[PDB]
Paper text:
We have been interested in a D-aminoacyl-[name] deacylase (DTD) fold that is present across the domains of life in two different functional contexts: as an N-terminal editing domain (NTD) of archaeal ThrRS, which specifically removes non-cognate L-serine mischarged on tRNAThr, and as a freestanding ‘chiral proofreading' enzyme, which removes D-amino acids from tRNAs in bacteria and eukaryotes. While demonstrating that the [name] provides the catalytic group, we show that the side chains within the recognition site are dispensable for the proofreading function, suggesting a primordial mode of protein- or peptide scaffold-based enzymatic activity evolved alongside that of RNA.
To rule out any genus-related phenomenon and to test the universality of the observation, we chose to do biochemical experiments with NTD from [name] (ApNTD), which belongs to a different phylum (Crenarchaeota), and shares ∼43% identity with PabNTD. While [name] mutant also showed a loosening of interactions upon L-Thr3AA binding as observed in the case of wild type, no such loosening was observed in the case of Y115A, thus providing a rationale for rejecting the cognate substrate in the mutants.
Author numbering:
A (entry chain A), B (entry chain A): 1 to 136
The structure:
Amino acid sequence: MRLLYLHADRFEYKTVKPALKNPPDPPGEASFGEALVVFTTVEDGDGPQTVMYAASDIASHSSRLKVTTVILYPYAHLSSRLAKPMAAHKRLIELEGALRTKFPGHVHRAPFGWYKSFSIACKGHPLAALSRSFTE
Amino acid sequence: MRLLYLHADRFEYKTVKPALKNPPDPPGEASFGEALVVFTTVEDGDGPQTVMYAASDIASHSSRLKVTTVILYPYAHLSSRLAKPMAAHKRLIELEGALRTKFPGHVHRAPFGWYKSFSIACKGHPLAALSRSFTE
Ligand SMILES: Nc1ncnc2c1ncn2[C@@H]1O[C@H](CO)[C@@H](NC(=O)[C@@H](N)CO)[C@H]1O
Ligand SMILES: Nc1ncnc2c1ncn2[C@@H]1O[C@H](CO)[C@@H](NC(=O)[C@@H](N)CO)[C@H]1O
């Protein structure tokens, strides 16, 4: 699993065209104020251990940043070792459930399997952009 | 070299704190309308061949997107095989010069070695976000 942690001032997205023949989540749109935006690329061989480590690390960083909102943003573009889309979906749903057991704030998982527009205003402090890898 | 191609409606950044003891470029800020934003992570072992391939590919994609502006945005966060910062700087300067020989539009290289805030509004079409790897 490869993650990009962006400490946003604001963030929004909207699904546009379906990126898979049958996107497993419905379309939609949302916007937020200050949040940790977690661009999330599920990688070949990710499993529940990987999910568990990633959730703990996201919760620990959110704590370090004093943020109350985490967006899990499916992203197909952070690595060249992608999990197939059905395994990918399965892992993101797991990641969402695992983070809730570790982080007391708002957890928002963006829909999986669509092309999406988004806007972000990302902070410039030394910890506002970091990337993480998790495996098992 | 790892690149993330974002087809933006708009993009801006400003340097904040220095990220290296002596950032080799001066601080600053800029904003743009429709541009291809190229988040660029220089990787261990990148050389002039890598630079040459990346410049050709960025020019070819910009053409495919009918964009007139390319932002080369140094980014330390797209891989776990980073080039040291002096080699990294050297490669980005090379990449900027190489792209100019391949693409007729505005080329803007953002400064290297600072933490930066940025805002982007990224398009949602099927080609608005893609990643590329180059080596030699
Ligand atoms: N291995 C993987 N990890 C994370 N997400 C993955 C994935 N495989 C497929 N997706 C999702 O399918 C859409 C098209 O690839 C993806 N959509 C996107 O990556 C959009 N932000 C592009 O606009 C994403 O929702
Ligand atoms: N291998 C590499 N490839 C691309 N850029 C690199 C690099 N090594 C160092 N940098 C630059 O130094 C700043 C701190 O790492 C980096 N700054 C950033 O990555 C900011 N966007 C964070 O706010 C970047 O300017």
